[PDB]
């Protein structure tokens, strides 16, 4: 049974890259991170920062989550992310994603002792 903190790392962390440099980064990564195994996950963001920089967002500014829940935290500094959106043509078992790379504040929901990120909420 995967932990909620290990799942956030798998779904949303790529510290090994600085940014996405191909249009097929999302296609390769969404498959790589088992994000297309059983359906095509319709959106997913990946964060190109060290795991300590991201984890430390849980000690930064407390904001509301978009569902209005309140254990979310916004990065003080701007961070390098890649948004993946399924294309209009994408269909399981043949998924397909647009890649968009950008430098934005992230918002994550945090939980636990260790208090660590468990959902990627949004960016701005």
């Amino acid at each position, epitope marked *: 049974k995967e932990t909620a903190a290990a799942k956030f790392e798998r779904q949303h962390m790529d510290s090994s890259t600085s940014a996405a440099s191909s249009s097929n980064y999302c296609n390769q990564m969404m498959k790589s991170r088992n994000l297309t195994k059983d359906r095509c996950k319709p959106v997913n963001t990946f964060v190109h920062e060290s795991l300590a920089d991201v984890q430390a967002v849980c000690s930064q500014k407390n904001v509301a989550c978009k569902n209005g829940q309140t*254990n979310c935290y916004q990065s003080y500094s701007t961070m390098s992310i890649t948004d993946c959106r399924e294309t209009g043509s994408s269909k399981y078992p043949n998924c397909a994603y647009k890649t968009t790379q950008a430098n934005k504040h992230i918002i994550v*929901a945090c*939980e636990g002792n260790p208090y660590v990120p468990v959902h990627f909420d949004a960016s701005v």
Partner: nanobody
Amino acid sequence: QVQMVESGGGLVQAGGSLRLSCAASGYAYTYIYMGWFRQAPGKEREGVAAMDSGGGGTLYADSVKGRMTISRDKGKNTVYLQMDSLKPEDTATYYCAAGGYELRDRTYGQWGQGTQVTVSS
């Protein structure tokens, strides 16, 4: 580091009153939600009461409704618990938490060491 400072606990007689106070020092912003939880001996931690930074989203556990009252200073990191008509059921270390959602234990990130509250029968 952020420090949590808790005060007001100790011994009381059954049917008496206590007031608990907690401030979070060192946090550069405002914790939207603060709350109180208690853990009695040989038990799991349980939610007692929570309130948001604008005085609303107030929320009380079944067991203490009508006998306890949370307040907060407006837009500030302090949370207060007026406890009344107390019982040996209410004996426990009471804990203050900041930064989570309502009384979902998992969602809160900062915790105090606690005030022990003992109510004799």
